[PDB]
């Protein structure tokens, strides 16, 4: 009780999981600010300024980038999930055996 | 009535007003009407500084 | 549509302390999340529905 009450870094193993997930979500949202080669990151700006033949080209650039950003996110979550699963499997074993 | 030369082109500032571009784009008097970064048919509901 | 800025959401009076020269705010997604009403100069919060 005294050790935990006096050591800020004691629970880093749990804090790291919280931090890594928060950094992945914030990264994903920030990618919505990316132009990906388009005239603007804001989809409404494209639709309000240009008509259909030139807007579609600009939109395709945002779709390509945003789809790529989301695919990156999900792949990382699957890899991270696998690591957490192994940790949970170990914890379950310790509960049974300790 | 008179227009400036190309070497000494004239600049007129437009501000503090409402603009109707429907008289310009739909005019038959123009040989060229080329817009960059914006559609002339959508320009009629945009705002500028 | 605020001064050419189009979007959809719920509008409310804002508690954000805008300085006189400020017309709008933005979020981390580069979206607008607060605007100044071009007639009443009231600051409004924007949240989607
Ligand atoms: C609108 O008109 C009022 C006066 O009736 C004025 O106080 C206000 O500042 C005007 N708004 C703009 C953007 O000029």
Curated annotation (Swiss-Prot), chain B:
Outcome of mutating residue 2 to K: In strain: Mu/B.1.621
Effect of residue 2 to T: In strain: Omicron/BQ.1.1, Omicron/XBB.1.5, Omicron/EG.5.1
Quaternary structure, from the entry: Binds to host ACE2. RBD also interacts with the N-linked glycan on 'Asn-90' of ACE2. Cleavage of S generates a polybasic C-terminal sequence on S1 that binds to host Neuropilin-1 (NRP1) and Neuropilin-2 (NRP2) receptors. Interacts with host integrin alpha-5/beta-1 (ITGA5:ITGB1) and with ACE2 in complex with integrin alpha-5/beta-1 (ITGA5:ITGB1). May interact via cytoplasmic c-terminus with M protein. May interact (via N-terminus) with host bilirubin and biliverdin, thereby preventing antibody binding to the SARS-CoV-2 spike NTD via an allosteric mechanism.
Function according to Swiss-Prot or TrEMBL: Attaches the virion to the cell membrane by interacting with host receptor, initiating the infection. The major receptor is host ACE2. When S2/S2' has been cleaved, binding to the receptor triggers direct fusion at the cell membrane. When S2/S2' has not been cleaved, binding to the receptor results in internalization of the virus by endocytosis using host TFRC and GRM2 and leading to fusion of the virion membrane with the host endosomal membrane. Alternatively, may use NRP1/NRP2 and integrin as entry receptors.
Protein known as: Spike protein S1
Organism encoding this protein: Severe acute respiratory syndrome coronavirus 2
Originating gene: S
Whole-protein coverage range: 345 to 393 of 1273
């Amino acid at each position: 009780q005294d050790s935990l009450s006096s050591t800020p870094s004691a629970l880093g193993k749990l804090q790291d999981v919280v931090n890594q997930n928060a950094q992945a979500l914030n990264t994903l949202v920030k990618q919505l600010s990316s132009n990906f080669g388009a005239i603007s990151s804001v989809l409404n700006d494209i639709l309000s300024r240009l008509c259909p033949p030139e807007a579609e080209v600009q939109i395709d650039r945002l779709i390509t980038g945003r789809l790529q950003s989301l695919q990156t996110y999900v792949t990382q979550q699957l890899i991270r999930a696998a690591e957490i699963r192994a940790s949970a499997n170990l914890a379950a074993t310790k509960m049974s055996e300790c | 009535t008179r227009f400036a030369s190309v070497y000494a082109w004239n600049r007129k500032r437009i501000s503090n007003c409402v603009a109707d571009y429907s008289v310009l784009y739909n005019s038959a008097s123009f040989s060229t009407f080329k817009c960059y970064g914006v559609c002339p048919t959508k320009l009629n509901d945009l705002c500028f500084t | 549509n605020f001064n050419g800025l189009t979007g959809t959401g719920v509008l409310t009076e804002s508690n954000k302390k805008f300085l006189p020269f400020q017309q709008f705010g933005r979020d981390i997604a580069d979206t607008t999340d607060a605007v100044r009403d071009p007639q009443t100069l009231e600051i409004l919060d924007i949240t989607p529905c």
